[PDB]
């Protein structure tokens, strides 16, 4: 009201085996629970509840897992439900985050005609991408992802690139930025690679350490700002979010406002969680078939989840960048179960990045008003 949901229509099921992914079962030692494909009755109950209860507008985002594994027919059905049951004539936004490997002519057409905003996961040029994003047999995926982008350009699907920043990304910002430029990808989101929740940090070859992230951010900013000066505008979600915070005092990105929200993550059995990073039994709010969205929001579990994020670290209280950074995403402060949050893992990276980039960030903000 408005309502935004993050739906996993094929649960944690996926066809790849990306090395850093903790959203899909990779092996005997990294298992993730799967509820299978969302049944029609759950999808129907979910869609009608959102249309009945939202005010203003609503948004349905499909992730996972690989959501195309639910099949095109599932999304056909989704659209049919939205047409028939939107009694309030709400504006509806749909979005899909995909590995792109199963995208074909049919998918591209459908996503284009139905105005989906699509996020396509691509870590950079061939070798960088393939290093971590492998298929079930350990083989390469980059060419199949390029094929999806090609189909999206052909059918005029609106899409953003989702790129995970690993230690390797930090060593090759030039290759990554230039690759995306050459492909004319104008909307980029760079996601810090997370180690698995509550594991000791920085133990994997891909692990993004704070010194790596500092190197990544400073260099990325330079390429971006050079483009800005030359009149080539590239949207980088993190920088866009800093600009919003500078001009408006708030950001449209979760994790940049200093406190958590309820993202209404819906697993394929209809179970609901407050954040994509926290699809765990201890944060299971209830089932969307049997509770109103307000009831889910008002649960003690959701209240607790959000309130834990209100704690401000002492360093943050005296930090010059507090009103810009706000302590960052709670997931990067959450070091051990049931313990109080601590200082953001990337605190040092933010400080050093701000010292490097703030003067130019202000220049951009002044120019976009």
């Amino acid at each position: 009201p408005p309502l935004s949901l993050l739906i996993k229509p094929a649960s944690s099921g996926c066809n790849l085996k990306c090395t850093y992914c903790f959203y899909h079962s990779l092996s005997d030692n990294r298992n993730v629970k799967s509820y299978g494909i969302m049944r029609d009755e759950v999808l129907e109950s979910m869609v009608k509840r959102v249309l009945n209860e939202a005010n203003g507008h609503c948004s349905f985002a499909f992730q996972g897992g690989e959501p195309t594994l639910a099949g095109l027919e599932f999304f056909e059905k989704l659209m049919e439900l939205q047409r028939k049951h939107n009694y309030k004539n709400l504006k509806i936004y749909n979005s899909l985050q995909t590995n792109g490997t199963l995208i074909d002519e049919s998918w591209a057409k459908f996503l284009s005609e139905n105005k989906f905003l699509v996020g396509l996961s691509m870590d950079g040029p061939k070798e960088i991408h393939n290093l971590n994003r492998k298929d079930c047999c350990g083989l390469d995926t980059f060419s199949k992802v390029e094929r999806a982008a090609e189909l999206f350009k052909k059918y005029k699907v609106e899409f953003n690139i989702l790129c995970v920043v690993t230690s390797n990304t930090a060593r090759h910002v030039n290759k990554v930025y230039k690759y995306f430029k050459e492909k004319d990808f104008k909307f980029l989101q760079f996601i810090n690679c997370l180690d698995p929740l509550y594991e000791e940090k920085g133990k994997y070859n891909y692990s993004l350490k704070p010194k790596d992230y500092t190197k990544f951010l400073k260099n990325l900013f330079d390429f971006w700002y050079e483009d800005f000066l030359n009149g080539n505008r590239v949207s980088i979600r993190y920088f866009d979010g800093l600009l919003e915070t500078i001009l408006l005092g708030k950001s449209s990105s979760c994790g940049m406002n200093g406190t958590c929200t309820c993202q209404f993550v819906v697993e394929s059995d209809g179970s609901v969680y407050p954040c994509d990073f926290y699809v765990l039994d201890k944060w299971r709010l209830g089932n969307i078939q049997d509770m109103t969205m307000k009831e889910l929001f008002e649960t003690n579990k959701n209240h607790e989840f959000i309130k834990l994020s209100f704690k401000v670290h002492e360093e943050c209280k005296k930090c010059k960048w507090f009103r810009l950074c706000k302590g960052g995403c709670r997931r990067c402060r959450d070091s051990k179960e049931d313990s109080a949050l601590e200082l953001n893992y990337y605190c040092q990276s933010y400080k050093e990045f701000f010292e490097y980039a703030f003067p130019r960030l202000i220049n951009v903000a002044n120019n976009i008003k």
Binding site: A61, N160, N257
Partner: peptide, 10 residues
């Protein structure tokens, strides 16, 4: 706001 690992604009 919008989730971290999801497509978003502006």
């Amino acid at each position: 706001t919008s989730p971290m690992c999801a497509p978003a604009r502006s």
